[PDB]
C-alpha cells in the first residue's frame, strides 16, 4: 500500500484518504490503473484521475469492483465556490447512496438513465476545512465497471434542476468504503 495522501503517478493526479482505523490497503500501478483491497476497513476513499477536473470531460474506466458491504464506485470530485461534493455512480455494494434523499430528476447517459440528489452534509470534514456543503448525485440504474462517462451530461442536467457547480477542483474515479470489504482494480483514462 501507499501512505494516504495525493500525488501524481504515471502521469494521473491520485487521492488516498482513510479515516486510519486499518484494513484497506492501496496501490497505484501502471498509467490510469489503481488497486482496492479491504477488510472490515474504516471510511476511505481512494482513486486516480485530475486536478483540476473540467466540465466537460469524457471519462474511461475498466476493469473490477467486488464489494461485500457498502462501498461506491464513482466519478467523484469538488468543485469550490460554492462547495461541492459530487458522485455520478456507476456501481455500489449494500447501500444505495440516494436512500432517502431528495429526487431532483433523471438523466440519460452513456447507456443508462441516472437518478438525480442532492444531500448536504453539516459540519463535516471537507477540502476548505470542516463546513456545511451540499451533495450531487446521479446514480445509475444499470450498475456497471467499465465504461465511459460523459461529465456535461450529468453536470448540464444538475444546473437544469437548480444544482450548481462552482470552479472545480480533483475529479477521480474512486472507490469509497464504509466499514465494509472488497476488491477492486480500476483503470482510467
Do not use: C
Not at 459530487?86 to 438523466?107: C, D, H, M, Q, R
Not at 446514480?139 to 465504461?147: A, L, M, Q, Y
Amino acid at each position: 500500500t501507499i501512505q494516504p495522501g495525493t500525488g501524481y503517478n504515471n502521469g494521473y493526479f491520485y487521492s488516498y484518504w482513510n479515516d486510519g482505523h486499518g484494513g484497506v490497503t492501496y496501490t497505484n500501478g501502471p498509467g490510469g490503473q489503481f488497486s482496492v483491497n479491504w477488510s472490515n476497513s474504516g471510511n476511505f476513499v481512494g482513486g486516480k484521475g485530475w486536478q483540476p477536473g473540467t466540465k466537460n470531460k469524457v471519462i474511461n474506466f475498466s476493469g473490477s469492483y467486488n464489494p461485500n458491504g457498502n462501498s461506491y464506485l464513482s466519478v467523484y470530485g469538488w468543485s469550490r465556490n460554492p462547495l461541492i461534493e459530487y458522485y455520478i455512480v456507476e456501481n455500489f455494494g449494500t447501500y444505495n447512496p440516494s436512500t432517502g434523499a431528495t429526487k431532483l430528476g433523471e438523466v440519460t447517459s452513456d447507456g443508462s438513465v441516472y437518478d438525480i440528489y442532492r444531500t448536504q452534509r453539516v459540519n463535516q470534514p471537507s477540502i476548505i476545512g470542516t463546513a456545511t456543503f451540499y451533495q450531487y448525485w446521479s446514480v445509475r440504474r444499470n450498475h456497471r465497471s467499465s465504461g465511459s462517462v460523459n461529465t456535461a451530461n450529468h453536470f448540464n442536467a444538475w444546473a437544469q434542476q437548480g444544482l450548481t457547480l462552482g470552479t472545480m477542483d480533483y475529479q477521480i474515479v474512486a472507490v469509497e468504503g464504509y466499514f465494509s470489504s472488497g476488491s477492486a482494480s480500476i483503470t482510467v483514462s
